[model samples]
Target: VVLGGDRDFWLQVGIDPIQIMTGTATFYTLRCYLDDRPIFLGRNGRISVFGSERALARYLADEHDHDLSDLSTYDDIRTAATDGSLAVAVTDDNVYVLSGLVDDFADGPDAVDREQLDLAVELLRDIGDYSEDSAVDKALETTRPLGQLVAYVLDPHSVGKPTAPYAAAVREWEKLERFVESRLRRE
Candidate 1:
């Protein structure tokens, strides 16, 4: 934002997605045109992908849902996300609610690698599939921080209602931050 001048350079993003009639995970990229100008492809024309590392990490150690001896499955987490049993977000220095992504399943994470992939998988939810990826990407790229987004949506001041899950999730997020940083630090 340019404060001195009345004009400001800005980026505004919106999401448009077309659900496939077949019920499969597929989509058509949107096209753009400027009043008879050449046609342009949508902002992003790629399928969304997933990372298993964070999921695996979540399984191996970070999981708070199971007994230490209980073997949780990756399918369980994925199911959880799909079913809305789990919630995930991205935040910066200040936890704010810049965006919210919900999963569409209700099972559980897979058995092999639910731990490590947990964080990455949850992070991916924030970058959901939109008809136009640019909007979503720009939002993710330009936001102050994932934390700020969380703060915006779930902060004490915002809702004025506190819950155990909310508080626990916050603690878990902090632990995740430290864990990811520690791993990144080794490299």
Candidate 2:
């Protein structure tokens, strides 16, 4: 029921929105699945869809061009949101599904600043790589517990940004994992 754009954008992000209450059957969106392999995409990435189920068959031009008798070409993305998956944000008229996993990596400025994810196209024009730097690492380490918490708030994994990064952190996580195991074993 929006003014002009396709209403299906809302549905992509699992939202039901109203345009004007001058309601009508708003239909002009294709629904399709993203490629299922690789298991990685950032928030606001693309998912392929068919304008109509028949479109797939129409191109093939079989007796079942208008028929979905046996094959099923329609499937809502089962992984709407989850860990090591993408987050979704719907700002303004459009819905943005993430490119890759939460708390991981998505192609962009690599600055770890909010700006990269927010303004994606601009990032495309100008982006930076985040090489592992001792300065950034030490910067994280010297902070007090309260500072750590504050920083976590700034880039919270609950919001789908990795607080601890990859490359170096995995080795540390192993120790943490072992410690947890020891505690559980005692219990």
Candidate 3:
């Protein structure tokens, strides 16, 4: 209709510009279920699970690829923002479904600081074989939080850097069986 109605027909005939818009989606929560048990993620966001350690190390390293699907066995899992969200992988042993899990981990950096870092460090030490002096020794050798030490050990960006002492730290976390008791739990 506009093509015929325009007063300046020559001006309109020359060309026309159309506007297009794009937007990014974000998640406020991420929930994972293993064997029908619920596991909630995010304090301010899921990445907060790592807190200052990741933020600090991220300051020095490029972002690493974190695929939640990597946590599961199937690539065909279903997900959505809320109600009717679905993702169930049936194994010989159990079924898993994760809801509200659309890149919530990628949303933003957690509000990290010394307290959470130190708490995570203490948690590491408590669950692992270590004394105050030994923990301090590893801290000095790695030059960052104990959590970052482990996070970077496997991280694509920060791996291959000098972190032999911190490698021991990563080992301890590996033994825990569940990084988060509810979500990543085995039993």
Candidate 4:
């Protein structure tokens, strides 16, 4: 049973007391497109993309039938933008309805590294097939931070540095690079 507890689902399906308690809904899978990216409004009330602003007046007043909202993602989006860690923006349409990218690293610093690696994989795929040396070069360029991170983690006599998380990042980084390398055409 999908347990139709999430509010977002109830809206699209038309609320029914009996069905709400017994069945699932399809709204969770539906997405709104913005800037060519599939933006998802999570049941827990969060937006999934950065660098774009979305108006929520209609969504709140209509679908959710609610008022003023609080967003936890905006804080990290501001920090990430300030530090240039990711592309982020607070658009002028930006009312209280608007929020920021979900903080994937909110749990800890290591999560940030993990997401970075995941994004690298996505980028490599976007660069097209690995039929030639150019593909390998592009992948390496896409993941330069992995090399830098590995070096930083292995630096001799480092002070106040967390080695465990850094080691884990390198392990993932190297594994991804090896996978890409394996697909390269032999000279």
The TM-score values for the models, in the order shown, are 0.17, 0.18, 0.20, 0.19
Report model 1's TM-score to 2 decimal places.
0.17
| Candidate 2 residue-wise lDDT at 19 | 14
Tens digit per residue, CA lDDT, model 1, 1-187: 1111122211111111111111222222111123432121122323221133233223323333321112223333334334443322212211212112211111111111323233333332323332233332333331324333333443235542222224333344444333322222110
Residue 72 lDDT in candidate 2:
31
lDDT score, candidate 4: 0.29
Go through the candidates in order and give each one's C-alpha lDDT: 0.27, 0.26, 0.28, 0.29
Residue-level lDDT of model 2, residues 37-154, one tens digit each, is 2111111222112233233223223232211122232112212211112222224433222233122332211333443234322211111111111322332342432224224434
**Candidate 4 C-alpha lDDT tens digits along 41-121:** 333232212221222212222323111122333333233334434221222222111011112212223344443334434
- Model 3 alpha-carbon drift over 4 Å, by segment: 1-146, 150-160, 171-179, 182-187
Candidate 4 residues lying further than 4 Å off, grouped into runs, are 1-122, 127-164
Stretches of candidate 1 exceeding 4 Å from the true structure: 1-166
Name the 10 consecutive residues with the lowest summed lDDT in model 4: 17-26
- Candidate 2 vs candidate 4: the lDDT winner is 4
Q: For residue 85, what is the lDDT in candidate 1? A: 38
